[PDB]
Amino acid sequence: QPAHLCFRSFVEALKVDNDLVEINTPIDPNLEAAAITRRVCETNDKAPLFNNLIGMKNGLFRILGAPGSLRKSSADRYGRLARHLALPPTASMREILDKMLSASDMPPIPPTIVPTGPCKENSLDDSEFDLTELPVPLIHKSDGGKYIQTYGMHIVQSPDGTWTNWSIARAMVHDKNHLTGLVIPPQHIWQIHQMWKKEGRSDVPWALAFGVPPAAIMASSMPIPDGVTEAGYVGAMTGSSLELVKCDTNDLYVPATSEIVLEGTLSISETGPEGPFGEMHGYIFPGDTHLGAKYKVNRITYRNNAIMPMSSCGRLTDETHTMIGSLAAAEIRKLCQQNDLPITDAFAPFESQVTWVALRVDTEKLRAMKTTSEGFRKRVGDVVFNHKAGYTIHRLVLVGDDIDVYEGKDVLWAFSTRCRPGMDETLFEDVRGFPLIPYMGHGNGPAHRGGKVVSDALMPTEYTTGRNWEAADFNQSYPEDLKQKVLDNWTKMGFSHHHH
Amino acid sequence: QPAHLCFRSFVEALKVDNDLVEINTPIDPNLEAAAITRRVCETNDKAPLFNNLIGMKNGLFRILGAPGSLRKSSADRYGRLARHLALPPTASMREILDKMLSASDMPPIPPTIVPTGPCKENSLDDSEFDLTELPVPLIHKSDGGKYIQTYGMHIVQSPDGTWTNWSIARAMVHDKNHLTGLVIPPQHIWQIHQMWKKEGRSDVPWALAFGVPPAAIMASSMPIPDGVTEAGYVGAMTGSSLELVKCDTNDLYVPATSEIVLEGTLSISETGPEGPFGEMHGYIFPGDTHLGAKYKVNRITYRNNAIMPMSSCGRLTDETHTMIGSLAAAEIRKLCQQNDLPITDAFAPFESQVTWVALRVDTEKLRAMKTTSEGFRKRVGDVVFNHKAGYTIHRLVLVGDDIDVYEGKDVLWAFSTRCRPGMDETLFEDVRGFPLIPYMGHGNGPAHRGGKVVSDALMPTEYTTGRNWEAADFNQSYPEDLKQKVLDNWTKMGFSHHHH
Numbered sequence A, B: 001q002p003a004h005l006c007f008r009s010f011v012e013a014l015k016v017d018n019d020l021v022e023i024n025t026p027i028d029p030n031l032e033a034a035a036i037t038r039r040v041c042e043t044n045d046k047a048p049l050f051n052n053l054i055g056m057k058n059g060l061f062r063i064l065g066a067p068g069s070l071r072k073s074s075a076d077r078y079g080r081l082a083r084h085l086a087l088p089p090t091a092s093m094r095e096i097l098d099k100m101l102s103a104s105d106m107p108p109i110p111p112t113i114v115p116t117g118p119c120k121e122n123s124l125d126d127s128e129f130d131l132t133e134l135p136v137p138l139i140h141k142s143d144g145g146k147y148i149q150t151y152g153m154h155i156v157q158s159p160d161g162t163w164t165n166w167s168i169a170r171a172m173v174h175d176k177n178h179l180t181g182l183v184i185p186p187q188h189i190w191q192i193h194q195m196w197k198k199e200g201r202s203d204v205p206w207a208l209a210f211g212v213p214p215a216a217i218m219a220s221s222m223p224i225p226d227g228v229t230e231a232g233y234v235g236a237m238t239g240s241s242l243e244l245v246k247c248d249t250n251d252l253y254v255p256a257t258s259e260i261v262l263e264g265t266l267s268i269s270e271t272g273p274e275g276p277f278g279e280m281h282g283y284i285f286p287g288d289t290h291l292g293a294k295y296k297v298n299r300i301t302y303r304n305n306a307i308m309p310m311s312s313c314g315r316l317t318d319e320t321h322t323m324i325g326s327l328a329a330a331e332i333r334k335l336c337q338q339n340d341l342p343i344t345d346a347f348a349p350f351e352s353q354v355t356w357v358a359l360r361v362d363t364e365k366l367r368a369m370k371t372t373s374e375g376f377r378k379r380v381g382d383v384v385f386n387h388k389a390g391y392t393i394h395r396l397v398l399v400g401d402d403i404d405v406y407e408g409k410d411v412l413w414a415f416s417t418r419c420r421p422g423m424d425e426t427l428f429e430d431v432r433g434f435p436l437i438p439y440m441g442h443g444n445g446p447a448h449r450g451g452k453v454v455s456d457a458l459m460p461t462e463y464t465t466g467r468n469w470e471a472a473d474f475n476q477s478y479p480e481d482l483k484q485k486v487l488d489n490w491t492k493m494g495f496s497h498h499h500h
Ligand SMILES: Cc1cc2c3c(c1C)C(C)(C)C[C@@H](O)N3c1c(nc(O)[nH]c1=O)N2C[C@H](O)[C@H](O)[C@H](O)COP(=O)(O)O
Pocket: A149, A150, A151, A165, A166, A167, A168, A169, A170, A171, A182, A183, A184, A186, A187, A188, A189, A220, A221, A222, A223, A224, A280, A311, A313, A319, A320, A323, A324
């Protein structure tokens, strides 16, 4: 099976890429696995595969850390993301995001039901497993539980059956047969939970599948539109119908090659302690005492020699930056274009801890709009910050056509030199805020409202007659024939490879 | 003579450090020298010494580019700055800035007058030179003139004789015997010019010395206090009285080892076209038509085989970042401490194009103040933005004790995660602004007023009971004994030198 359609094949692809370290000696899931993974993520090293995890019994489980993190080289920086999508390992961010957006004006390709698959090689009923007895990692030393769920996909369906959502949301072990996790607005798992709670009749049928097709986990991380079933979006993106098997204990369908499947219910009434957790912005607040949603597990099914993917998230760079930030930015780009805004590209700079999105403006089109900064900022902010795709993003930076938004140095340059603080910005206090950002949920103001800004790094003539500067850089402040002479004579004169 | 006290010895020191490339083949001062230098600065390469400059006659002149730019290695990143100051080449920014501040509570060491020096080896009177006939560089293709003055020191004295100021301010050739240049408030060259203009009797006696003692050019770039004679500040910093010779045609004194000296007057009445110029923020606005101050040159004296230092300024990283930004930050640190503010460190992040300064707060002392963000931000902004040392800086970022302000990644992390836009900031519209920043002088608002902000990246408990988080990073979210185990086994397991 292809790497983008089968997690087990994806692990092999990483090994073949010389992008895997197989650790075959015993590693402790209490902190050691995650510490190694954290170090990998901070240094852009090879993904670790823990084949000998202290506490693994009867096949549950090995761990793969850093599945969507960065490679050290510039040439294949985003190669692990490219391997989720059948793209060349040298694919650019633009190419990755365009692949993730490609299904947005294609007909869905619904999934295919098959009678069995690898995820049914082993099962454990209600009397045979205990989630406290599995090698679930403690990921950060002050976490409030063992976070089994950092890179699996929750599967829930609307009461009417019409929308099946796939998404990543964290969850930790509560007891032998329950999890607690985040289920918060405006996320689709929360929207669907609310539908079941208003109906009031039953807990939500649920499954959580770990080690799913890589292309599926990418969509699971992306804010595709309300009511859109991720399975059919992934089918259209990949050009293939995904093969799904039915759960044993409910009528949901999971990917046939899933490494590990939990089946059970998401309560419409119960809660339990959840967190704290070392989060995407780089922080943990030890002892926070929040409540979260409560999941009951009725059955586990799994592949022989199952592998659990794990995100050891926090400071740069991990899946919470590469996937959450970039995929939100992609969706925001499309949203802006659907609202007739002249945006060509969008990216969430890593330097901003993926709290900013830079929006590259087609300034020819801007000029034809005959508008002003105040008016355009307000329009862009209203579109993005009133929509779910804008949830995680607190600062939008508008930049002209000279800026490569995928290059954080250039975004920072433009922001710092072209946006006058206050005058060139519009604050939004009456929009949903993202409480996970420390200055929101642990800050001076409302945890859930406001704290958003549009920062206009377009210069005045970009609205009127065109760019009126040249950069004071090698590229722009010297003629072509001189530049080429300098480069051609660089080593001859005495000064100092693409792949490396 | 020591490298920090003699430019010619500094050039040798760079050669000995394997930090120099001597180009002995012909190089054009029309753009080619500056293009090579620009490339050096963008890539942190070795400083270029142009020994064969097309148009050099009778000893005027060779060029040294990138005299205060960065080295590629982390270990000696700031080595060229350290070589201005007799510091080890591995000196940290903190060590450099502390050296530059050290003279602030020492008695001055006034300069020593000597009867002659190398700067008198050659002279050209009023009938023997033509500044249009010297190999003055065109530094950027759209510059409005040939910028002879990018790394020399202007010398002017108050009418009463009590204050002799040394400073860098740009100037370009106007005609055979005049320059035009920037002379703008609140700079000391402007303050002293205003004193002569109010007296109304004569043009300002002036000299411009190129290739001065490196320790002198560093002070020339620093906003030491009003009325303080840089020569005596440099004397105290270096522990040595600087040796100065009298000008031939006026009673000013120049460093005895100056490579090239212009003597003449700064007009109290005349102006001429100045700029545009590819400036420290990375821009040129071709055709801007400003007027600037006008200098008359009466005499040139110079060393045999004179060397003109040149800054090919613009996008990162050059002397306008390493020196302007860092030295302003140093002065701001001291200013804050003299105003009883609990600031330990200050740095202007390169990523901000040196328009921000991050201020590290001793939060134990902050807690004892029993204050709030709004009140403390306003106090810090009032101190810094009402003072000359704050002129160039438009955003102050307050950070707690965990942040290394000399590490821009960490400043950006703190800013992006701890400062709620709007609520955690105070705007200052009634302070002097820096018009060179594009969003000021080419922006939507007053070129000379406002556009400043204090951004508080202190978290709420930093004001009250203490930090209430741990970072989700390798350093903070794992115990010591685990971290050390992981590092000790890193290569054994299969994962990947200080000097490189
Ligand atoms: C890639 C990735 C995504 C998420 C998360 C993680 C990773 C690795 C954790 C490591 C588990 C940390 C976690 O905080 N986490 C997370 C989360 N969304 C939440 O509601 N809750 C969460 O706990 N997202 C983001 C969501 O996956 C996206 O916002 C997606 O758009 C949601 O899908 P949908 O609601 O649009 O269908």
